[PDB]
Design a protein around this ligand. Structure first.
Ligand SMILES: NC[C@H](NC(=O)c1cc(-c2c[nH]c3ncccc23)cs1)c1ccccc1
Ligand SMILES: NC[C@H](NC(=O)c1cc(-c2c[nH]c3ncccc23)cs1)c1ccccc1
Ligand SMILES: NC[C@H](NC(=O)c1cc(-c2c[nH]c3ncccc23)cs1)c1ccccc1
Ligand SMILES: [Cl-]
Ligand SMILES: [Mn+2]
Ligand SMILES: [Mn+2]
Lengths: 673, 674
DNA sequence: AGCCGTAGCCTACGGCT
DNA sequence: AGCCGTAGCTACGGCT
């Protein structure tokens, strides 16, 4: 992939390590090809601080870089053999580019340290902002970043080797907790010559913070990561409600990528596909048409071949969003507005769960039954001091979209009391007696997130390697009519219970869910227990409904004000018309109407905008009937805002309506205790 | 790769040859894995009627099929070794799926003919319509196409061997002209269980061939556009992507075009849009691109998620008056949208930007031209219907390439213009300089149209290496944005630089030919046309566009004047109007009362009822009367255009001259007299 | 020793000094 | 000849 330069005098030659194939092709066209070489890197590269020597040496990009430099590595490093005297790290001016920078410096420090000590390693300075290298043309990349006459390069400098050793070990090594403490202790600070320790700390902090608060962890209030929230908001802004026709996924994803989510379309589309899978989401948020994948790990077809829209339950996540219930923010480029959180009129975080690998931490929250969840929220609203054990009278435990069994309540109880616990998920399997003493095992439900075809291959593997005994045949007979159905035939000699018990132990036929409930609370990650998760969601609903009521109250008062001016005008229309006719301009008519009938500017404006058809008999009555209905509505809104109990009951009534409309039976059976 | 079935009893097993990877994955999931195997095909496959034996045997997809079947080929072929007793052709029910069917049947008939005679070859019958296989889920493909219990299969049968041999030879072989004659003869019959193989070949290839001719590879004579380019520019217009507005991500532009009008791969759409934004490809660029949009060295544009685009100003003239009932709209591919059959094209875009296209039975190759020269030619033609091509060449000297360069003589230009066909020699602009003290060098500043600069330089270097050219010391590409193209060729002292340059013309793309072959769609049919005929169809298109625009504006102006007459009556008797309205209980009563008391039409009584009170102020009253008086002169002016053909023709002349004055530019390519 | 989920071509077709 | 232009691997954490 290396596009070398024509010169062979290393002293004047420079190689640019460029993030991205798009930027790789543009820099190859914009470079001074006499003295500048380009090695494009696909994206994220191996972290050699966590990797074994065999994987480092056999890694393709590591090998391309060694071969391009010519120095060798480690002990065999020969600085005199360097083919370039400037090695220039050139990544996007964003958090992922900063991550690629920390990964490249980790490789140079552990395997080519004299390269750094000699001053040969540099960091390019492309234009900052939201536009990445791949979006610039070849002349721009030359004039701003590669041209020696104009560019600014940072020369990486090693000042303290002991401090650098500890910095690379802490940021890039296997001990997660020291890395997490560094992130937590510097979060407020997040997002020529360059000290390598300062570059590592500052670039890794920016990346790790952005992954934590703007990528991999869901918000406690609506249960969504930014990519999902932007998909669902984009469906709402595009009018993609369940009553409208399906829309091509490429159009949906392209709009979301351009307006809110400036990342690879595959990240957006695969997150949309998951929201449409009934084996992944307990309450699917997207309604898909076409091939959207399978339990067997099949991917969806390419997004130009599929279509989608919202499900009906997603309408409840977006409900009241245009009633100043949630704060909007500027998008990535300042050209759009996007919601910081969705109103989320059902507890989505616990309902559909969440899995996300961040930096310094990860999250793993199982899905739940929505009837149970809303019951728990209702019980909580009536008892702020409710205990977790009493909440478990409503919320028995997780409810997976793929059904199955859970073994005992001890794991469930641990997870709910502390945020962490190991939950054993077992497939639903029965042993059928057959003629001739024969037996067969029939599996109709498998654990959550288990790839069925893969599970079946594991069993086949054990049978092929003689690791298990007595299996005569293994068939996947799953169908649309029957659902999951995996059949295992047993030898007459064999005992089916022994085989089945061994299958739970050696295959994904039984798998554990490691609960680790971490979500963003007030924008920051916290490990939360079940009651904490329900309290933050209930507080979210009280704030949404309160803000909606205040919005509706503003709007009703403004309309009542307008109708008051309209009534006056209609009651004295001849006077009104004559005032307007004797006015030469709109401004004079406005002033004459306000001065004579003691109307407001808003009232006078509405009168001038009133059409002649409003002068008919039924119209006067229509205006009066709307006015009286508005007065009753204003009084009702004020009653809600005046009594916290009235507001809380409104929240209860609306949660109960959602429970009745969307609540469904528990699928996963919780065995024993 | 092949996804085999579990059973090894051939007579119960079936293999499906599935079009596309997406459909291949979903058929693998929806099939009966016991007895059904899937072999997905990337897309179009080798035509074995045109390929020699070493290319066929070396083809990966041919090999996979041969290995999957187990029969061999020949000759060395054995039916008893067949691994499936059903080989099912499963392609989209569209023209490209029909093409893949003809390609697969050609491989079976030429290399596995006893497979057909044995009855083992079948054609799947997926749901017809616009949705393809790749758009269906796994259960739909099973229930409609693969389930033995509910599916319909066509068993391919070979009735007459001689007829079949001739059919395969004509449709799929190398003699283009007999294939073209077949298309022309049966064109009327295009795109409107045992299945005869000859009938299947003739019907499926006709459908494909006709579609490529009339709705893919050839431009319309009136606006100079292929379907993909017309839908790109129409989409930019519907998305409001005018030059005044901000750039928009290309992935959004392409996604909308693909979902609304062009149900094909996004790469076809994007790459076509990219070409319209390159000033080395389009003499008058139709797209304004931001980001990396390629280079003369064959570099591709950046991926469409990284680039942005909008219209250029001149593209506004292709779309001007499109919403004035100047052109016919048609239903899109799925009936959910409307799209233009042709753009108004207020400048002659076919000849201005040219066209290149490879269809079936024919191809086209039309070079770009200077817009000032073209419009003067159309103006000359509008004043003299009997003007000759030689006289039109007094306006239109010849092609004008965006890459400038030289054309050697007028003899190929004149043949092309008189007949539609002719060879034109394009030569780079090169000068010989002195670089001290006795040394010389060749500096190339312009290269021929459609020539890859890097590829050309590599060719020269190839000659130097290989000692095919004796006198070159150095070869450098000093092209820059400021400099423009600049390729430097250093010559050895005392070596003749004139001799090396002349040899470089003869041995490299430094001199290259443009084979003119002016085929465009005229009345929906492909036609070889000379220069005058191309200009004649364009002028008739413009007369029709301006006439239809004038008719539309007149009806709109009469409607508006009619409404203004009602408002003026309401203003003259406003007291009566108000009283009449107040007196009425409902709007319907007010409507009826206004009509029967003031002799107003229903439309006028509605416009009065919709009149806002602010229209009653003094300035607003005068505005109604001032609009009406201006409208009456406008109506008179429009009726003069429609009453006299000469008046209409002069308006066409005036508006074409305004586009010439606004957009016309200097000739770039020098036509050297030789 | 891997798994979860957001991130960073070949070919048809015609013509041609 | 071969070309033109519209088509059909890794990071990260935590379990095991
Ligand atoms: N117990 C809390 C602890 N939090 C953290 O590790 C981190 C907090 C932040 C953070 C983001 N924005 C901020 N703004 C101001 C201050 C801090 C932050 C980044 S990491 C934890 C969470 C999850 C698991 C264990 C421990
Ligand atoms: N809408 C009920 C109505 N009164 C009014 O609306 C108002 C009118 C005026 C007013 C100020 N100067 C005038 N000069 C001419 C005309 C009106 C006015 C201010 S309020 C009414 C009034 C009396 C009886 C029934 C209903
Ligand atoms: N007549 C010249 C000849 N035409 C053709 O080869 C073809 C015409 C058509 C066709 C499309 N739509 C139709 N509708 C009715 C009848 C025929 C058609 C397909 S091929 C030619 C053109 C260009 C070059 C050589 C020969
Ligand atoms: Cl009158
Ligand atoms: Mn980036
Ligand atoms: Mn298709």
């Amino acid at each position: 992939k290396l596009a070398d330069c024509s010169s062979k005098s290393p002293e004047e030659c420079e190689i640019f390590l460029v993030e991205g194939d798009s930027a790789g092709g543009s820099t190859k066209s914009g470079r001074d090809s006499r003295t500048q070489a380009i090695l494009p890197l696909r994206g994220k590269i191996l972290n050699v601080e966590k990797a074994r020597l065999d994987r480092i040496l056999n890694n393709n990009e590591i090998r391309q870089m060694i071969t391009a430099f010519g120095t060798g590595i480690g002990g065999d490093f020969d600085l005199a053999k360097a083919r370039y005297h400037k090695i220039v790290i050139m990544t996007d001016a964003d958090v992922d580019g900063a991550h690629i920078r920390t990964l490249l410096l980790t490789f140079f420090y552990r395997f080519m340290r004299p390269l750094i000590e000699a001053g040969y390693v540099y960091i390019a300075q492309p234009p900052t902002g939201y536009k990445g290298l791949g979006e610039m043309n070849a002349d721009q990349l030359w004039e701003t970043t590669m041209n020696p006459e104009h560019r600014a390069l940072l020369q990486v400098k090693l000042e303290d080797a002991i401090e650098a050793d500890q910095t690379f070990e802490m940021l890039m090594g296997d001990v997660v907790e020291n890395r997490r403490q560094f992130i937590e202790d510097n979060a407020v600070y997040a997002n020529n010559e360059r000290n390598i320790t300062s570059e590592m700390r500052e670039s890794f902090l920016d990346y790790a913070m952005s992954v934590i608060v703007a990528r991999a962890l869901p918000d406690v209030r609506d249960g969504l990561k930014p990519v999902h929230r932007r998909i669902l908001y984009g469906l709402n802004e595009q009018g993609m409600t369940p009553d409208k026709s399906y829309k091509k996924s490429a159009r949906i994803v392209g709009d979301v990528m351009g307006k809110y989510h400036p990342h690879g379309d595959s990240s957006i589309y695969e997150a949309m596909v998951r929201m449409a899978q009934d084996f992944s989401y307990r309450y699917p948020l997207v309604d898909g048409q076409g091939n959207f994948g399978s339990m067997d790990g099949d991917g969806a077809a390419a997004m130009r071949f599929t279509e989608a829209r919202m499900t009906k339950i997603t309408l409840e996540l977006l409900r009241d969003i245009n009633k100043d219930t949630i704060d909007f923010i500027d998008n990535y480029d300042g050209n759009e507005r996007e919601p910081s959180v969705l109103p989320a009129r059902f507890p989505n975080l616990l309902a559909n769960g969440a899995s996300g690998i961040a930096v310094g931490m990860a999250t793993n929250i199982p899905p739940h039954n929505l009837t149970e969840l809303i019951n728990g929220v209702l019980s909580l609203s009536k008892n702020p001091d409710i205990s977790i054990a009493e909440l478990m009278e409503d919320i028995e435990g997780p409810d997976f979209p793929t059904a199955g069994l859970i073994l005992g309540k001890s794991g469930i109880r641990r997870a709910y009391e502390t945020g962490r616990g190991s939950i054993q998920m077992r497939s639903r399997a029965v042993i059928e007696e057959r003629g001739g003493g024969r037996q067969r095992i029939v599996v109709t439900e498998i654990p959550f997130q288990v790839n069925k075809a893969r599970m079946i291959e594991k069993i086949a593997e054990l049978v092929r390697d003689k690791k298990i005994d007595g299996i005569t045949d293994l068939r996947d007979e799953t169908s649309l009519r029957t659902g999951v159905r995996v059949v295992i035939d047993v030898r007459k000699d064999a005992n089916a219970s022994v085989i089945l018990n061994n299958l739970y132990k050696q295959t994904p036929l039984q798998t554990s869910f490691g609960v680790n409930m971490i979500a963003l609370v007030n924008g920051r990650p916290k490990l939360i227990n079940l009651k904490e998760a329900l309290v933050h969601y209930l507080e979210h609903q009280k704030t949404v409904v309160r803000r909606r009521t205040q919005y509706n109250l503003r709007k009703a008062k403004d309309r009542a004000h307008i109708l008051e001016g309209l009534r006056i005008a209609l009651d004295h229309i001849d006077e009104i018309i004559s005032t307007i006719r004797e006015s030469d301009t709109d401004k004079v008519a406005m002033e004459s109407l306000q001065q004579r009938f003691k109307l407001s500017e808003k009232q006078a404006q509405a009168i001038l905008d009133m059409r002649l058809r409003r002068l008919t008999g039924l119209e006067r009555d229509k205006i009066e009937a709307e006015y009286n209905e508005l007065l009753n509505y204003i009084s009702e809104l004020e009653t809600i805002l005046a009594d916290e109990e009235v507001l809380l009951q409104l929240v209860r009534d609306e949660l109960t309506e959602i429970r009745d409309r969307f609540g469904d039976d528990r699928r996963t059976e919780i065995q024993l205790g």
